[PDB]
Amino acid sequence: RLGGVCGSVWGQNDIAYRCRTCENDPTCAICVPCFQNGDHNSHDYSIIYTGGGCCDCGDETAWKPDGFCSNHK
Amino acid sequence: RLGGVCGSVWGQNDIAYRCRTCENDPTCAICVPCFQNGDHNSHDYSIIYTGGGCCDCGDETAWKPDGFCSNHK
Numbered sequence: 001r002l003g004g005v006c007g008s009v010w011g012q013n014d015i016a017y018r019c020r021t022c023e024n025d026p027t028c029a030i031c032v033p034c035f036q037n038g039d040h041n042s043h044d045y046s047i048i049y050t051g052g053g054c055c056d057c058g059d060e061t062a063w064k065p066d067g068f069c070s071n072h073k
Numbered sequence: 074r075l076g077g078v079c080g081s082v083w084g085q086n087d088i089a090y091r092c093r094t095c096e097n098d099p100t101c102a103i104c105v106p107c108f109q110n111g112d113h114n115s116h117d118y119s120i121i122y123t124g125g126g127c128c129d130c131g132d133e134t135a136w137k138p139d140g141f142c143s144n145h146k
């Protein structure tokens with residue numbers, strides 16, 4: 001749609017997605033809804049336990065733009 | 074062909090198409106190539122300046138499927 005940066009904050013034991021294909025570095029991660037509203041088919045992704053943090057979807061300095069979801073472009 | 078969701082991101086002054094017949098709501102839009110590879114003949118469409126955003130072609134939650142292009146079905 002006509003045009004963000006994902007807020008979402010995780011608590012200590014909240015899950016998220018790591019995507020080794022899209023991440024800017026290994027400490028990056030995106031929340032589950034952003035993972036599911038993007039395209040990671042051939043990608044080397046994994047569910048992780050975050051230990052806390054915030055979703056990088058929409059932040060070109062933390063995540064490759066081709067890995068952004070529908071709502072953060 | 075045997076079987077997507079359009080990536081395309083617009084910058085601030087990039088043009089796209091609005092189609093009032095196909096849009097899920099007034100903030101939806103599709104890129105020019107997807108507009109031209111679909112069927113909008115009787116439709117109430119307009120060229121717009123996007124202010125940024127991403128193409129909704131292929132996203133049934135942002136665009137009516139009969140307005141999808143050749144490559145996003």
Ligand SMILES: [Zn+2]
Pocket residue numbers: 006007008030031032033034035055056057
């Ligand atoms: Zn997110």
Ligand SMILES: [Zn+2]
Pocket residue numbers: 006033034035057058068069070071072
């Ligand atoms: Zn997102």
Ligand SMILES: [Zn+2]
Pocket residue numbers: 019020021022023039040043044045067
């Ligand atoms: Zn990915």
Ligand SMILES: [Zn+2]
Pocket residue numbers: 079080081103104105106107108128129130
């Ligand atoms: Zn498109």
Ligand SMILES: [Zn+2]
Pocket residue numbers: 079106107108130131141142143144145
């Ligand atoms: Zn399309």
Ligand SMILES: [Zn+2]
Pocket residue numbers: 092093094095096112113116117118140
């Ligand atoms: Zn249309």
